[PDB]
């Protein structure tokens, strides 16, 4: 088993215990790279109500390497948590935060009623209610242009068939669970044929040559015999392929 000899941990906690979460219409994105990602901490936690992985299993995350991890975060209403998934429709899935159908990542959510609700109502959390068309996966739209519902141009003015596109969640401590705020973190795992920069907490072993071994090179796995090569890899090339286009 061979992984880059890095020891710094990934700033996941910095995403999860942030004082302020974004509105879903204007969700935040943090790029995570060049670090060790321990996902057992997040998964084995008793604090999350939702922890759903798509594309990967939650118990194999620590054996994987990714080129990049994105951590998207926002607050939504409890009933809308089901919309943060592949293949969903609804006001959040369509106008605020869209996940691709081939999404690889984990959706993590927890009830944050004790942080985000106010007695008179917390009106700082917004969602897009109207949009001319659905969002593309991972698209943001933070405009406040008046939505034209009819055939008559609005010219920036609200009125009959002219709507302000955003609306607030009136988050109150007395709301039922489906109306309580949830903090959502979506971890998107990018996999392209490039150096991996985010790897789980795997220990490396000594390199063994001229013997049949089970190997794992920065996420590349297989069985074979490792020998010294006479191939001239260019400084940027990480692996090679045969005529058959196999490693």
């Amino acid at each position: 088993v061979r992984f880059p000899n890095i020891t710094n941990l990934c700033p996941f906690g910095e995403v999860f215990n942030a004082t302020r979460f974004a509105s879903v219409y204007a969700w935040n994105r943090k790029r995570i790279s060049n670090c060790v990602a321990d996902y057992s901490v997040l998964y084995n936690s008793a604090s999350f109500s939702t922890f759903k992985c798509y594309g990967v299993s939650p118990t194999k995350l620590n054996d994987l390497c990714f080129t990049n991890v994105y951590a998207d975060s926002f607050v939504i209403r409890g009933d809308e948590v089901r919309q943060i998934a592949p293949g969903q429709t609804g006001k959040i899935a369509d106008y605020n935060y869209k996940l691709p159908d081939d999404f690889t990542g984990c959706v993590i959510a927890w009830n944050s009623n004790n942080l985000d609700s106010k007695v008179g109502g917390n009106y700082n959390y917004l969602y897009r209610l109207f949009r001319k068309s659905n969002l593309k996966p991972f698209e943001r739209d933070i405009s406040t242009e008046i939505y034209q519902a009819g055939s008559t141009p609005c010219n920036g003015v609200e009125g009959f068939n002219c709507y302000f596109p955003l609306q607030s969640y009136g988050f109150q401590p007395t709301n039922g669970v489906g109306y309580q705020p949830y903090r959502v973190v979506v971890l998107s795992f990018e996999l392209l044929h490039a150096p991996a920069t985010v790897c789980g907490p795997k220990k490396s072993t000594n390199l063994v040559k001229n013997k049949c071994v089970n190997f794992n090179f920065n996420g590349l796995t297989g069985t074979g015999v490792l020998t010294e090569s006479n191939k001239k890899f260019l400084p940027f090339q990480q692996f090679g392929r045969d005529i058959a286009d196999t490693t």
Partner: antibody
Amino acid sequence: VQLVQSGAEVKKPGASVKVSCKASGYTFTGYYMHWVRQAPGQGLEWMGWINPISSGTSYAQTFQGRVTMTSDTSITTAYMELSRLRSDDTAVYYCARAAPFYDFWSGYSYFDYWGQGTLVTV
Amino acid sequence: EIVMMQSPGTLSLSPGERATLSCRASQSVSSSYLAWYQQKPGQAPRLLIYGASSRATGIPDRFSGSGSGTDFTLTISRLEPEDFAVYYCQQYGSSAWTFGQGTKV
């Protein structure tokens, strides 16, 4: 659902008056706040509205350029500010709740909740 | 603009009897945009009927409405002391809310 208005005011002609309306029991930004005036012995007159989510407004032509409507969602309160007052403005001012124009059913066509009126004398 | 006219200006009847109030309009009104309010002396108006015929929440089944076009009515099947108040018709159209002059019961 409650709408609670400020107490009575007495102003000189040419002055300005501000009448607050505090909302509770509902999502403040989900509704429009309208104001309706009732001069003594008269019927009801619509003045205009404020949409708290965007602070969007519309005014009746009668008060257009005379009244400014504002709101503050942090305290779920609507304000009417009527300037350049005249004796003909002596009236009871009511705040009223109605649905936004996007309501599928015409909830914007009527006022389902009213505050207690505030008497303003000029 | 549109003139909203109610009739009679004053209705006179006894508790226990039936009352009908009418609202006429210069121009045709979608039934969905016609509403009725009750104002007791010293109190804010409260919604009775909306959409011409639908009762507002908390309103007794004694109150009903009907109408279309230019002609709408409010009927009280049986009156109680609380019904001897001023009733208004209200309509939405264009971009404005128009009230009738009110009829006293």
